[PDB]
């Protein structure tokens, strides 16, 4: 390995960063809405805060992200956040349905909201653009839609009666989810409290958006009414008034982004997102920057890694300088190698 | 006496001092002076750096030579005939970097069989001989093999030392090193093509000789041609996955018949070829791996033995054309001229009849290997090559015939022949109607 | 009509006469040339699943090592039936049709629709344990010699080709782990994460640990030694065995005292109450009853 394909080598009052409110929900991501719901259920509103962010504003580069102010630790992901901040068939069912919702219900909301280019272009992309500062929603929503379209593969479906394929691939997820009895204290299966927050996040992003191709809202409202009753009752209980009584930082949901969004910081985020698309050195800039941000997240955790490996940036600079130097050496050329008149005399 | 060469600014005063400093050592035999100046001027144009319209040798009283240099950067694009139907090449040349040297970057993406073919070829002369060149190549290909249904991805670098001698013969000595990844298998692929599907090296070393005394390459009417390619892979200091020894001898000729200069030109030809497996390491006695489909010969086609598919004439596993180890070929021609036309148009009327054989190499008669069943020792490989050479001349070869109408372009040769197979083997896939042949190498 | 003389066909080369001339069907797997002569388990779990299923279906077959490029699909485990003629062979069978090839009277237990709870538990195997296998094999520098031995050194003998193939393997595996969102779902640019720096490999480890404990609880529920109380193993059993066997084989070391991080074979042997190591021994004792060479 070039040390970028290996495990890193080590020497010998929380704040939740999330996306922004959309569709009458406190977030537009499923894992972010799950994390908001978990912290609102467990913690009190004088214990935590909610900061509106982008994956370029946190070093974890994964937006449901906790910053514990007691130890200055950076924790990314919903399962990591709930591993922090913390009969046997109930626990095994919670683990199984967490792994199932992350793996088989995540490419279904992806097909609904990001792959369908009449849904994305008319509902999803304006709601993504209304929460970022003004030069940023030209670089980040393409990367988000690209990642969600990558996740929505291994399903054989895309944006092109070829509607019964969508209905079969959505029944294959909702039939597994319909036997858990989420909005219940009795009867059926029982899971832990955090699995119900994850299920609310995915299922409420499936149901509640107002979309022009509503092929998933109607399957849920026609065949699976218990899940729709679960989403409506959970949203009426945990988030009344649309997620505006949540402790957003500095007063409101949009004024919570104003700390890490100045001219310099937003400019640097956009400049780095532009530098990663250069056709030759943009891979190695991205690898070097990702390795640097991983090193600083690990140092925030408590580890002490070995940082001295800059061969990614030097390899990218070598490739760019090699192409530029070859182009200038072959197009501008060298000075001329002879004169016009070249006399040879007969030697004596 | 006093020699001046004007108008050569991107040439060193060593490259054209090796040429005209022998000339001034002449210390009243005016014809010898003029012949030596003409010989030096013909040697100077052997470097491909000057325009042919510039060479003016204006004497006085002494000498005063003038030249016009070619331009440095030559971008070019078009359509080449690399023995295929089409090609869309782009070609960037830097003509004279320091003195005599050049670079050629070729990028030929073709929708027919080779979807990409990248190149980079630096080339110098050695010690001021314009005929001895030295090239350092680097390639990356991905070429579909539709006869034996797969693709071959070839990345590597080779170092060729060409040599044109004083009698028009051309030697060559390359050290190649490739990767040769086989993939892209069609659903109609055979078990033989699936057995060899992966990565190789093939670091080889191949001599090439040519002796081209045909008066016209694209349409011969007299002369002959002898060509001898001869490779050695894997054995000794070379290292790879394959280790063989492959030779190939091709002959030709044409003999005119009388009426004037009427273009009758009874033709002829003969190809041979033997692929021998060697051990790996500095020994001849030793166990040897048998060949792979990357290395075996392919006979049949429009350019090769007229009347068959573009891979025919050999062992077929189902429909795929897997190769042989020992082959033979040959043809006769008649090339009669067209009526109401003089013997100067490139149009000719061909009457060919080819034949061919392409057999493989197996280890029957000695099968006490059992496990570790692929490697074969020297006596088994020698008896296998003896049996394959004996199986060449055992039976009437796979023969076809036909007529045609040859058009002789300066860069290619278009044929458009109507063929008719006569003798086949089973599963050999000969074509029976109108066949089209475009390219240079024909038999 | 016109070819006036047709002879008997030309024989195949010696290589195909040795490799492709068996009388049993042949399953092409990721194995070594000494394991394939005996029929031992593969070192790829996606091949060992189907090999275990074909050995529970009482099918007579061989194995032979192969590469992904020879497969009718992209990925490896496929089958080639015996030839009928010496120059003609039937069509290959991909991995989706292997249990349909094998009928060996009543194989309805190996190809059956699982309950939905079984599908939630199967997502554990196909994601939380697959990503753990990929992260700990392809990206851990401890298993670099094992990775070269198993995948790179049989491919060729040239160091440049070996290094390039190992790089493509690591790039592909790091792409796979960073898609499924245990510890990998980062957004850095318009191109997918293909390095080990866009993976949080403590979330991958913790998800593997929780997956193993949940699967041990599910096996404790069953009370007839296979999953869901069956009397004969099914596809769930072969799917879990394909990971638990290779973790106890290739990933059970002693290293665990200087890094923390109990390894994957020790996590299999310790999950629950040893419910899964016992299941691995019972699954070897049914499908490979003649092999006594396991536990490492």
Numbering used by the authors:
A (entry chain C): -34 to -23, 2 to 75, 105 to 178, 237 to 424
B (entry chain B): 47 to 73, 78 to 111, 127 to 324, 329 to 512
C (entry chain A): 26 to 128, 139 to 289, 292 to 333
What does the paper say about this structure?
The SAM complex facilitates outer membrane β-barrel precursor protein folding and insertion into the outer membrane. The SAM complex consists of one copy each of Sam50, which spans the mitochondrial outer membrane, and Sam35 and Sam37, which sit on the cytosolic side of the membrane. The structures of Sam35 and Sam37 reveal that they each adopt a GST-like fold, which is also completely different from the BAM lipoproteins.
Therefore, we performed particle symmetry expansion in dimer 1, focused on only half of the dimer, and proceeded to refine this monomer to a final resolution of 3.0 Å, resulting in more clearly resolved side chain densities. The first transmembrane α-helix of Sam37 is well defined, spanning the membrane adjacent to the Sam50 β-barrel, but making no contact with the β-barrel. The POTRA domain adopts the classic βααββ fold, and is positioned away from the barrel lumen, allowing substrate access in this conformation. In both lipid and detergent, the Sam50 β-barrel adopts a kidney bean shape, with dimensions 50 by 40 Å. It is only partially closed at the interface, making no direct interactions between strands β1 and β16. The Sam50 β-barrel is only partially closed, and PyMOL analysis does not identify any interactions at the lateral gate.
